[PDB]
Amino acid sequence: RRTAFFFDELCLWHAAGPHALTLPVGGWVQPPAAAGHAESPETKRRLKSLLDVSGLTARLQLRSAPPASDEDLLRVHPAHYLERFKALSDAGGGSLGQDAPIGPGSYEIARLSAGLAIAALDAVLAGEADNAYSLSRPPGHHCLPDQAMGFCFFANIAVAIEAAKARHGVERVAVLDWDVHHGNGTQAIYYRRDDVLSISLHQDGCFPPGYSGAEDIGEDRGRGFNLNVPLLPGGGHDAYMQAMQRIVLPALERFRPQLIVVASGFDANAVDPLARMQLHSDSFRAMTAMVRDAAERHAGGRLVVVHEGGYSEAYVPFCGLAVIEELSGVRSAVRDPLRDFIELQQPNAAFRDFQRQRLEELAAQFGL
Amino acid sequence: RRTAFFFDELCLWHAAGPHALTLPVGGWVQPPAAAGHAESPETKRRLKSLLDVSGLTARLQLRSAPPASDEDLLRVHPAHYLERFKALSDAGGGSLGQDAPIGPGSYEIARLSAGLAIAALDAVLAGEADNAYSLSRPPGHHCLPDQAMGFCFFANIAVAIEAAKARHGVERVAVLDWDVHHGNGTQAIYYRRDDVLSISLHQDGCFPPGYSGAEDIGEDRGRGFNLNVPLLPGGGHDAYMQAMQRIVLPALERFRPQLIVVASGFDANAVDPLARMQLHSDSFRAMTAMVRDAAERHAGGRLVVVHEGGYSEAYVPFCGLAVIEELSGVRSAVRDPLRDFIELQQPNAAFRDFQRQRLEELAAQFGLCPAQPL
Ligand SMILES: Cc1nn(C)c(C)c1/N=N/c1ccc(/C=C/C(=O)NO)cc1
Ligand SMILES: Cc1nn(C)c(C)c1/N=N/c1ccc(/C=C/C(=O)NO)cc1
Ligand SMILES: [K+]
Ligand SMILES: [K+]
Ligand SMILES: [K+]
Ligand SMILES: [K+]
Ligand SMILES: [Zn+2]
Ligand SMILES: [Zn+2]
């Protein structure tokens, strides 16, 4: 298997103002002695370092890309959003919204991030690679057409999908979003459309806060082409496998995608500060293995994984590495040091069964 | 209310080797650019800074203490453990166990940490304060008599309780441990004893990993004087209030404690990396309010809160501040910035009810009886 890895060093240079985790500094929030921000370069930098140090980078097609053109960005975002964002980035940073701070030059870096997503889809559709991974920072899955939220400033996946349809004429795209937070940007953008199947597994009510969304199945022609799977907080491996087996794979089986795109956040991992789920690196591996199987069935193997959230400096590198091993079919020597520990922490049988019953009920609600 | 605050700057100087969160550096674990360890000074340092900046410190009795004497330590720990620990600390640090790394001079700092717990109980029992908070670092609730684990090197609360019994002759002590991890050290130490009631609320199977412990109710005379409440991961405010109302308060009501000690970790907070629970600062306030009510009933108000875990730099300071406001009865101007956000993230009704049913079933297993306070 040829796996392309889309990365650029400059994506790691996007830096907002001082924060303690998600909280802006000022008032009662003391400035951190070190930390700085949750959506930090270091999560992505350490993944990259680990891929290098593992040898895995050497077995991938390392690519950069040109930034997203205005034509590409305007397919999703109004011109007035582009100018407003540019103006603030040029002026020296600030706030595009709450949960959406930017630094100087963040406009160019976000364009680059979107560029990498564009190029990844392009490369898989052109036959240059069997599949691809885009280390896009800043992330995109929360971004609305004219509102930045959740540290997302362009809808990277939506921009990449539109450019793919415009260039190659793909008719059925499926987006599986396994970041722990609800992918509201992707849902909004394609809510009335039947050509993009949008699936989001998320922690019930995490972010956006209090949002579950199981009833929200799409409008108009999109009715039945959006699926929200709000998992109960504290769920881990089994919860996700059940969701995949009972909702995700049946949904894909009916929709017959010609391309599969994954919005892959790793903030469902068991040590993430920004969610309450219990995934380990082999959960993401198993999910990647299942989604590759479906791409081989309907899409001729065509699969793209785009990096989204993940806030554990320590553990995200291992979770992302497991995905890329599964994509490439290359197993490195790296061994997850938390795997065995996290296994022991999983929900008990009764809690698993409670979550399982809910997923069976949701499956029936969706007609699967 | 007079509230004593036991703190010493030196407790913040205990530092183990390089770690990424809980993982030792080396092998496939890259050295952090900044962080260092999870059990880090900054969580405790920021709490202290906030108390200062809020004005709250000025309304408390700020105290240090002498380190724990050998006599005090030997009541819980064998001499062989003391020498072995001292030897390694003198030698320049290393590992006392896995999940128990130490730096140079950690022996003296752990003694100090235990000293502060000793002094807090002493001060409340002598009538110097109505209640007290001990900012003990390193923590103690995992420490076994001859094994350090979970970043704990002396059983601070056990040492403080034994010194209290030896000095003052208290007969019934209750320890309520609301750190998110199972307080195995406290359980082990007092497992065959009926003079110390040990209660632990924890996330089911979190740490120690895979341990639930509901069946473990004490041995011999201790049978019925140890209670484990393994809460389902993802639980928050309501889960804890139910546990308090259905298990903790009825248990205390029957046991009639003459002193209440809280092993207060804040790692059950909703942004903690080391657990999966959803508590906010007003959950800890409400728990502190409930446990003060029980101390006023049976113990003449005598309550001590000892600081344990908590790994969110950003959020722990607010959670601890809420406890100390409740202890002192002094409300500062500080407002929790995550409170409203965390409320929206709480478990849905069906999940709450599922957890509630399990606590009712656990209550019946303990034979606990839901009477109201009297
Ligand atoms: C700013 C701010 N201020 N406050 C008061 C709160 C509560 C704030 N942030 N909340 C957030 C914002 C974003 C996330 C996760 C994003 C992600 O995972 N993308 O995949 C989590 C919490
Ligand atoms: C995992 C893992 N894997 N390895 C290899 C190591 C050395 C690991 N440490 N795990 C731990 C150990 C202790 C805690 C205690 C938390 C606390 O709040 N005490 O109250 C949490 C995680
Ligand atoms: K999601
Ligand atoms: K759709
Ligand atoms: K506990
Ligand atoms: K006991
Ligand atoms: Zn996310
Ligand atoms: Zn703890």
Residue-range domain boundaries for chain B: 1-374
Whole-angstrom distance, CA of residue A136 vs CA of residue A263 = 10
Give the CA count within 13 Å in the CB-facing half-sphere of A301: 16
Residue A147 phi, psi dihedral angles, 5° rounding: -145, 125
Residue B124 in tokens = 């409340």
Whole-angstrom distance, CA of residue A64 vs CA of residue B23 = 32
Phi-psi region of B334 (alpha: psi -120 to 50; beta: other; left: phi over 0): beta
Please report, as a single letter, which amino acid is at residue A248.
V
Contact A322, A338 (CB under 8 A): no
Whole-angstrom distance, CA of residue A284 vs CA of residue A253 = 20
From residue B290, alpha-carbon distances to B316, B323, B368 in Å are 20, 11, 18
Residue B202 phi, psi dihedral angles, 5° rounding: -150, 165
Whole-angstrom distance, CA of residue A331 vs CA of residue B137 = 42
Write the DSSP symbol of residue B176: E
Rg over CA atoms, chain B: 19
Ligand nearest to the CA of B178: 5
Residue A63 in tokens = 């690519």
Whole-angstrom distance, CA of residue B281 vs CA of residue A5 = 43
Out of A19, A142, A182, A298, the active site residue is A142
Q: Across chain A, how many H-helices and E-strands are there? A: 12, 12
Q: Across chain B, how many H-helices and E-strands are there? A: 12, 12
Residue that has been written with the tokens 């903790």 in this structure: B248
At residue A67, the 3 state secondary structure works out as coil
Residue A338 in tokens = 């938390």
Q: Decide: B12 in ligand 1 pocket, CB within 6 A.
A: no
To one decimal, the resolution in angstroms is: 2.4
At residue B349, the 3 state secondary structure works out as helix
Peptide bond into B370 cis (omega under 30): no
Pick A337's closest partner by Cβ from B28, B34, B50. B28
At residue B154, the 3 state secondary structure works out as coil
Q: Decide: A8 in ligand 1 pocket, CB within 6 A.
A: no
Residue B321: closest CA among B64, B39, B50, B9: B50
Residue B269 in tokens = 């907070």
Ligand 3 centre to CA of A201 (Å) is 4
Residue A93: closest CA among A80, A79, A106: A106
Ligand 3 centre to CA of B347 (Å) is 18
Whole-angstrom distance, CA of residue A225 vs CA of residue B220 = 62
The dihedral formed by the CA atoms of B360, B365, B367 and B368, expressed in degrees to the nearest 10:
-40
From residue A229, alpha-carbon distances to A338, B341, B343 in Å are 26, 21, 21
| Catalytic status, residue A202 | no
Residue B330: closest CA among B84, B6, B12, B2: B2
Contact A236, A359 (CB under 8 A): no
Residue B311 in tokens = 């790994």
From residue A252, alpha-carbon distances to A220, A296, B181 in Å are 20, 12, 40
**Cβ neighbours, 10 Å, residue B194:** 17
Whole-angstrom distance, CA of residue A232 vs CA of residue B233 = 10
Out of B141, B142, B181, B298, the active site residue is B142
Contact B47, B321 (CB under 8 A): yes
Residue A45 phi, psi dihedral angles, 5° rounding: -65, -45
Q: Is the dihedral of CA B359, B363, B369, B372 positive or negative?
A: negative
Residue B225 phi, psi dihedral angles, 5° rounding: -120, 30
Minimum CA–CA partner of B53 in chain A: A28
The dihedral formed by the CA atoms of B3, B119, B287 and B265, expressed in degrees to the nearest 10:
130
Contact A30, B50 (CB under 8 A): yes
Whole-angstrom distance, CA of residue B95 vs CA of residue B257 = 37
Q: What fold does the segment set A1-368 form as a domain?
A: Arginase; Chain A (3.40.800)
Pick B345's closest partner by Cβ from A35, A205, A270. A205
Residue A128 phi, psi dihedral angles, 5° rounding: -70, -30
Whole-angstrom distance, CA of residue B161 vs CA of residue A197 = 61
Ligand nearest to the CA of B196: 6
Contact A198, A183 (CB under 8 A): yes
Pick B35's closest partner by Cβ from A28, A34, A350. A34
At residue A129, the 3 state secondary structure works out as coil
| B42–A30 C-beta distance less than 8 A | no
Helix boundaries (H) for A126-261: 156-168, 184-189, 237-243, 249-255
Q: Quick one: A220 exposed, middle or buried, by C-beta within 10 A (0-12, 13-18, 19+)?
A: exposed
**Residue B213 with chain A: CB contacts under 8 Å:** none
Contact A303, A124 (CB under 8 A): yes
Residue B297: closest CA among B245, B346, B327, B255: B255
Ligand 3 centre to CA of A115 (Å) is 22
**Cβ neighbours, 10 Å, residue B225:** 24
Residue A131 in tokens = 């599949």
Whole-angstrom distance, CA of residue B143 vs CA of residue B161 = 15
Whole-angstrom distance, CA of residue A54 vs CA of residue A57 = 8
Of A336, A338, A339, A341, which is best to mutate to test ligand 2, by the most ligand atoms within 8 angstroms of its C-beta? Answer: A341
| B313–A21 C-beta distance less than 8 A | yes
For residue B198, the Cα-to-chain-centroid distance in whole angstroms is 12
**Cβ neighbours, 10 Å, residue B166:** 12
Contact A288, A304 (CB under 8 A): no
Kind of pairing between the strands at A259-264 and A226-231: unpaired
Whole-angstrom distance, CA of residue B276 vs CA of residue A277 = 7
Whole-angstrom distance, CA of residue B26 vs CA of residue B272 = 24
Whole-angstrom distance, CA of residue A344 vs CA of residue A281 = 14
Contact B38, B273 (CB under 8 A): yes
Residue B101: closest CA among B50, B37, B6, B159: B37
Q: What fold does the segment set B1-374 form as a domain?
A: Arginase; Chain A (3.40.800)
Contact B158, B149 (CB under 8 A): no
Contact A193, A173 (CB under 8 A): no
Residue B86: closest CA among B77, A276, A346, A38: B77
Kind of pairing between the strands at A173-177 and A196-203: parallel
CB neighbour burial string for A95-125, b if at least 16 within 10 angstroms, e if fewer: ebeebbbbbebbbbbbbbbbbbbbbbbbbbb
Whole-angstrom distance, CA of residue B80 vs CA of residue B70 = 12
Contact A141, A127 (CB under 8 A): no
Detail the DSSP E strand segments found in A170-300.
173-177, 196-203, 226-231, 259-264
Q: Quick one: A349 exposed, middle or buried, by C-beta within 10 A (0-12, 13-18, 19+)?
A: exposed
Provide the angle, in degrees to the nearest 10, between the axes of the packed helices A79-91 and A106-125.
130
Ligand 6 centre to CA of B193 (Å) is 5
Could you say which residues from 46 to 85 on chain B have a Cβ atom under 8 Å away from some Cβ of chain A? 46, 49-50, 53-54
Contact B78, B145 (CB under 8 A): yes
Residue A76: closest CA among A148, A137, A15, A173: A148
Residues in chain B: 374
Q: Decide: B22 in ligand 2 pocket, CB within 6 A.
A: yes
| B312–A232 C-beta distance less than 8 A | no
Q: Is the dihedral of CA A163, A165, A168, A172 positive or negative?
A: positive
Residue B235 at interface with chain A, using a CB cutoff of 8 Å = yes
Give the CA count within 13 Å in the CB-facing half-sphere of A182: 24
Contact A31, B314 (CB under 8 A): no
Detail the DSSP E strand segments found in A54-172.
61-63, 94-97, 100-102, 131-134
**Residue B314 with chain A: CB contacts under 8 Å:** 20-23, 29
Whole-angstrom distance, CA of residue A45 vs CA of residue A48 = 5
| B209–A23 C-beta distance less than 8 A | no
For residue A222, the Cα-to-chain-centroid distance in whole angstroms is 22
Whole-angstrom distance, CA of residue B197 vs CA of residue B250 = 12
Residue B301 in tokens = 């108000």
**Which residues on adjacent β-strands are paired with residue B97?**
B100
At residue A174, the 3 state secondary structure works out as strand
Residue B353 at interface with chain A, using a CB cutoff of 8 Å = no
Contact A67, A114 (CB under 8 A): yes
